[PDB]
């Protein structure tokens, strides 16, 4: 079935707990496979040690720039960027997992988890999963955000991997 992956997240050196995500490989296999491998780190690189660099309360929490560590970078298992697979899944509510981008067909490794329904991103950002467990962790992360997106705590993915 669909992969289940996890992110263990710190805020200022103390553990917040674990976010578990289902990756919808049945709808978006390529996008799901990318996130899966970046979680395990099996290609030699991935999310372990990277940060949530942009967090905006009542919107979303953005992470995954493990190359430049500032929100301009990241890369996929396929190459630096890969196409928008499809826009079949929608940004329906809190807990939606979706790809950040710099316009059409520029998916890399950056992703976000919504804390509200973000319908205006439908057709622009590829939705590829959702939060199975650990929305409390997502809310903690959200609480350390700000209007500009700058975080008030250092939010790090200390460990990540595949559960099934
Ligand atoms: N591969 C790659 C991906 C992203 C980037 C940098 N691009 C972005 O951060 N773009 C914005 C973006 O993807 N998102 C996800 C929802 C959060 C943010 C976003 C998306 C759409 C509207 C937003 C309005 C205000 C603040 C953030 C907005 C560079 C390289």
| Helix, strand, or coil (residue 76) | coil
Task: Determine the straight-line distance between the first and last CA of the chain, rounded to whole angstroms.
Answer: 8
Q: Which of 130, 123, 155 is nearest to 140 (CA)?
A: 155
User: Helices H, strands E: what count in the chain?
Assistant: 2, 8
- Dist CA 161 CA 68 (whole Å): 21
Q: Which residues of 95-106 are buried (b: 16+ CB within 10 A; e: fewer)?
A: bbbbbbbeeeee
Architecture of domain 1-164: Beta Barrel (2.40)
DSSP run (H or E) holding 62:
strand 60-63
DSSP run (H or E) holding 140:
helix 135-143
Method: X-ray
- Dist CA 88 CA 79 (whole Å): 24
- How many CB atoms sit inside 10 A of residue 33's CB? 17
- Dist CA 52 CA 62 (whole Å): 5
- Dist CA 95 CA 19 (whole Å): 10
- For residue 20, report the phi and psi dihedrals to the nearest 5 degrees: -105, 135
DSSP run (H or E) holding 34:
helix 29-40
Closest protein CA for atom 24 of ligand 1: 59
Residue found under tokens 């520029």: 106
Residue found under tokens 């807990």: 95
The reply to whether ligand 1 has any atom less than 6 angstroms from the CB of 118 is no
Residue found under tokens 């979706």: 98
Q: Which of 18, 59, 87, 162 is catalytic?
A: 59
Q: Which of 34, 62, 107, 110 is catalytic?
A: 62
Q: Which residues of 121-154 are buried (b: 16+ CB within 10 A; e: fewer)?
A: beeebbbbbbbbebbebbebbbebbeeebebebe
Q: Please tell me the distance between residue 112's alpha carbon and the centre of ligand 1 in angstroms.
A: 9
Q: Which of 112, 128, 130, 144 is catalytic?
A: 112
Q: Please tell me the distance between residue 69's alpha carbon and the centre of ligand 1 in angstroms.
A: 15
- Dist CA 29 CA 1 (whole Å): 11
Domains of the chain: which residue ranges? 1-164
Both tokens of residue 57?
Answer: 């309360």
59 labelled catalytic: yes
- Dist CA 49 CA 66 (whole Å): 8
Q: Which residues pair with 15 in a beta bridge?
A: 10
- CA separation, residue 20 to residues 23, 65, 101, 113, 157 (Å): 10, 19, 22, 12, 13
User: Resolution to 1 decimal, in Å?
Assistant: 1.9
Q: Which of 72, 75, 80, 124 is nearest to 98 (CA)?
A: 124
């Amino acid at each position: 079935g669909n992969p289940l992956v996890y992110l263990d997240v710190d805020a200022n050196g103390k553990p917040l707990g674990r976010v578990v995500l289902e990756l919808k490989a049945d709808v978006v296999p390529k996008t799901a496979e990318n996130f899966r491998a970046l979680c395990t780190g099996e290609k030699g690189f991935g999310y372990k040690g990277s940060t949530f660099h942009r967090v905006i309360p009542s919107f979303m929490c953005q992470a995954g720039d493990f190359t430049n560590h500032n929100g301009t970078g990241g890369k996929s298992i396929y190459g630096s960027r890969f196409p928008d697979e499809n826009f079949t899944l929608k940004h329906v509510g809190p807990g939606v997992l979706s790809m950040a981008n710099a316009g059409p067909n520029t998916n890399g490794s950056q992703f976000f988890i919504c804390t509200i329904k973000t319908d205006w991103l439908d057709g622009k950002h590829v939705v590829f999963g959702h939060v199975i467990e650990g929305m409390d962790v997502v809310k903690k992360i959200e609480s350390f955000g700000s209007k500009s997106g700058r975080t008030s705590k250092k939010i790090v993915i200390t460990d990540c991997g595949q559960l099934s």
